[PDB]
Symmetry: D4
């Protein structure tokens, strides 16, 4: 499995002249104002991944952020609500064309309440995501090989997931519903950053 | 004064709604659109008058009301439009899509309270007292009582004024584009409820 | 104004119950029939009068009342008959079979509220103010107070009129055979409580 | 060695169901019948074989199956019939009258345990291991899917016989019968909008 | 109005407690006897008068009061004696063991309610209105305000009458020996609390 | 060897129980004594052997066993006696006076844990693995399985040894008189359960 | 009502009314979340029966006179539930006071016979006073505050001096003075912990 | 495997603790210092060795240990020092001033997990599998077992290394002054526990 490890940013975008990119982040935790962005992982869906180490206090990542704001490229996330929040918070740029496999799962896998990426991978691809490195020091100067491998595998499968979910969304006639959710998702992430992370803004109470 | 025009089935015409924003509210037999039918639709232009339209059981159309709801040039103002949008779309087959919700607006601006009910908002923003005593009554009755007609009309009489104040607040706190994205999703949030996700926050992690 | 006939043990005859439906309520020392004995049985024909029957500790029979409760040609009207059927069957060894329950009926028609208590229903459907101050008193006292006699009577004075309204609403919402099935099972539901399943919804998944 | 006959849409005929009681189960896209369509109906006569019927999306009719469902001289056996009766009636418009439910039966007899799932029941009563390990709307079911679907009806006759012995011994037969008589209306109540409500509760 | 004798440290003598049963109550700085000291001990013979005894910080003895509490021929009547026995035993080192508790008696007889507070019991059994406004105040104050002494006294004024009524109920429902056994264990239930088991129902399965 | 004697109805005689203390356990159809009958009674003298007695449906007497249960010179050792005393007394009409409970003893001595089940206690104190697999089986079967017989016996085989250890800990931690008072109340706690207070901590404030 | 209240824009004109040992402090905001809900008003009483009400503007970053007061080691800052006020004051102006007294902590250390420790409840019991919490829900960011708003904000500091005195009496009586002192010393860091991201976390709990 | 010195009562001297920081752990009869006595104190200098000190019931003095505990030139390292400080100060009357707590450190640095127990911390930071089997054993036994001794020594063996790693993370994330202030308050937090506030977050709004 080719994993390309970088300091700061992609060297260029030669591997990303594509319709859709898989994106994932690693952080020091779930609170963007407290827990910094540590890693950004990318994949074109060709079985290879780029793992990008983000330094403490890093202000720019010009090639990556160009990708994130290219409206002709769909950004695929699993639970992008999280990734979009810490990415926009770090680099000041909120993507607006996105696909989320966790939203897709909740719209199609109506026979389960387990929508984690591990469960989705095991069910739709018979691929075993190992969640051991999830709780590790992602801010470490040098990432372990197990850290690099775990971070890369969280992006390696998202294109295949996207294709299967797109089939299910069409079969159950929920395409326009999913699209509206994906359209709002950047604003749902913004709401989190502005102080509404604990509030379902559409709830009655 | 307290002018309330009560109608059977539909508005007779749209003469009173050559305007850019109409206040809308409904009454039903309950909170479950597949079980509890639409019984009343209330409208107001904001001129202190109100229109109250009784909806018959099994009624599938209301062409004048539905033209108003369909008009992309007319904003439909609701309090908690998530509810009204769902029952209206389920009954008449059309989902409005230019909307404004005073409850979402309140949750985006009245950040100092967990009380965002229409009664609370009217009390604090306008010093108008709203009585919820008829909220739980037989809205399906063939003839509505006078207390019933007045309660229903007062739920739309004040929404124009609330919208103006919330728009000031959304501007002052720089939350206009946030509020607009929420209103853009609201019709689909209501479709999610009809489709079977009414108990699910679709954006939650678990 | 309201005539209340008080009896010890049993009605003297059934001269006042040559009718097709009788309102029935009970008073007890509490909610657990194996521990809390039946203290009072109240009956009404629907004519604005009531009979209040004091049941002695250890009383095993009441022939006239039990004949009433066994008469399949006479519907027994309860509010939440699930409770009354259990204590009645436990005390006298007879489970009434032809019943109407205003609380089930409320849950089947008053779909716009979650308050299905008798006091709530009387206020909304009849504009009649039950007072619940005497519900918590010593119903086993040798002499019932004037307040107790009044309260016990008022819990059967309106069940006929409630039934007529709920029956109209069940017809309107096309829920008659649903209601009839629930009333059919209700004696068995009360038997289930006596047998040991009072805490279990027998139909729940878990 | 378990014979499983797979069908598209309906049984071809009723030659294997000239019987007093049939085991019935379903697979769906989820627990909410207004959203999650019927995908599979499974039947067994109790002879160790099963019929697995694939229900197409949008399918309105299944004449042989539905004839069975509405034949009052044939008892429909379920595990938690409340669910299956709801999706069957919602899909084909016919609510069965004459039913037997092993989950209700378990709750009336297995008073020594708090676990009334079919897997728990089979393990204890029959020493049989049910495995509950998917997309039931797939065009082609997998071998594992076909076998899981059949295994949920192969045991209900034997479970029913044992539960009848326990209902008789504990003198709860007429209690069970009344619960079975109400069960179709309980499923109907679910479809009308009372799925979250114990209709007999005080509050 | 109410004759209340206020003392510092102890009763001046025992001349008013040559009786069969005494009503006892306490005031503290809180519910945790290792942190919250005893501040007041109230007594009454049931004659309409009460003694209110101020306890000093660090006071280790109260000879006349503790004589009463140790007297086996004198029943001590508490409402929720579990609390009073704990703090009385902690402060003075003597644990009464001839006791009667109106809360336990209420839970054994007033099976038609779940409200067993003293104010609730006083209202129902005696039509007497205990006011609880002074419950949360500085009972450690050097000088108790008239409001406090009146509140302190009212908590012992009625325990004799309540005991009589509950003893009739315990006889009627044939629970006398049940009540006796619970009263017998109550000093040890208080000890269990002081020893570290106050959050544990020692008899619960889990 | 583990010799288990199986009996129908009662012990043949008391020749194996001329002892100071007897281990007792029961099996039933469930946790509700008014619904779930006594099925098995198990006894052990602590000599490594056990008697397993099958109780028939509707059995009213067991003269030798019940002689043991009311012999005040023999302590009856249970694990969670609150349960066994209730079903035994409910079945045969005789409530023991003199008991020891290993679960209460565990709650008073094993203050470092919240797991007080028999299996847990046997594992820690004796390094004896009790299997709980047969705990939920049909105990009313005409013929018990060998696994059932061996499971039933093993619930009484270790209670004497547990008693010895808990008594050592009660002594070391100076809690003997606390335990004794708990054991003295335990029959009345079980009696309160049968009378209708099974869900009530009678000593709780609320 | 109508006690003397001096309403200011932005800051105090000077500190002439604050050559004292302890100052009563309170704030009004748009909510409980300092990173979202801006500081709107600061209220001060010297204990002399008068009060100063300071309008804070959106985006305002300095209040030199006020901040001098908050930074003064010789002047104790008295709050009710200072955990909140310290966080929003530190967040808006960049300065965290560290000589503080809190009547809610003190209430939790002395009023051990109750579980109601809000300012309303303390004032009713200790002083026989009503602090009409009805204006708690109003627009504290309005251009012009109402007379009703000015008097509610002012009354939330008129009583803190008398409350401190009664509580110091209680801490002395129950021998908890050094316990209260330790709690007050940590309080500014408890406020910092909230701003930094631990507002939902009892940092000392086992879990 | 590792050198463990077992002592009765106290260290013989401080020859092994002429150091800047000492790792400290205790074993007890439970979580409640007023009820559950100190049984064992464990120490380590960080050199791979440990001292295991058996504390007798009623023991009032441990002069060498307590000299260590009050030496302000020696940092005392705990995991969840809130517990150990409370029981140590309660037992010997001396509260350490200068402490470091790995669980507070963890809550301030391991912000990517919600599991802060010592086992989880060792697993992640050191790849060290702490066995927690001996947690539920009789720590007050006269003679500890080798498994007990070895489990007791295991905790303190890693605290110096954990401290070093946690200090690196506190420096990296710029939280050292935050941590110092928490460690400075920690002895008063343990004091609050002994004084009666163990269930109370003293800094919370409610
Ligand atoms: Cl049928
Ligand atoms: Cl005995
Ligand atoms: Na992700
Ligand atoms: Na990741
Ligand atoms: Na309305
Ligand atoms: Na609405
Ligand atoms: Na009734
Ligand atoms: Na009644
Ligand atoms: Na199935
Ligand atoms: Na047919
Ligand atoms: Na089933
Ligand atoms: Na008391
Ligand atoms: Na009192
Ligand atoms: Na057993
Ligand atoms: Na037992
Ligand atoms: Na404040
Ligand atoms: Na304030
Ligand atoms: Na330890
Ligand atoms: Na520790």
């Amino acid at each position: 499995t080719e994993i390309r490890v970088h300091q700061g940013d992609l060297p260029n975008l030669d591997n990303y002249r594509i319709d859709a990119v898989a994106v994932d982040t690693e952080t020091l935790g779930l609170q963007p104002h407290r827990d910094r962005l540590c890693v950004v992982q990318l994949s074109s869906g060709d079985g290879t991944a780029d793992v990008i180490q983000i330094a403490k206090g890093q202000k720019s990542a010009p090639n990556l952020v160009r990708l994130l704001s290219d409206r002709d490229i769909t950004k695929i996330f699993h639970f992008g609500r999280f990734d979009l929040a810490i990415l926009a918070h770090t680099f000041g740029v909120m993507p607006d064309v996105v696909f989320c496999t966790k939203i897709a799962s909740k719209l199609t896998r109506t026979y389960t309440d387990r929508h984690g990426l591990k469960e989705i991978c095991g069910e739709l691809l018979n691929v075993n995501i190992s969640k051991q490195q999830q709780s590790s020091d992602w801010a470490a100067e040098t990432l372990s090989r197990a850290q690099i491998e775990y971070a890369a595998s969280d992006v390696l499968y998202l294109h295949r997931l996207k294709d299967i979910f797109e089939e299910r969304l069409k079969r159950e006639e929920r395409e326009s519903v999913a699209k509206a959710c994906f359209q709002f998702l950047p604003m749902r992430a913004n709401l989190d950053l502005l102080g509404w992370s604990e509030i379902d803004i559409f709830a009655h109470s």
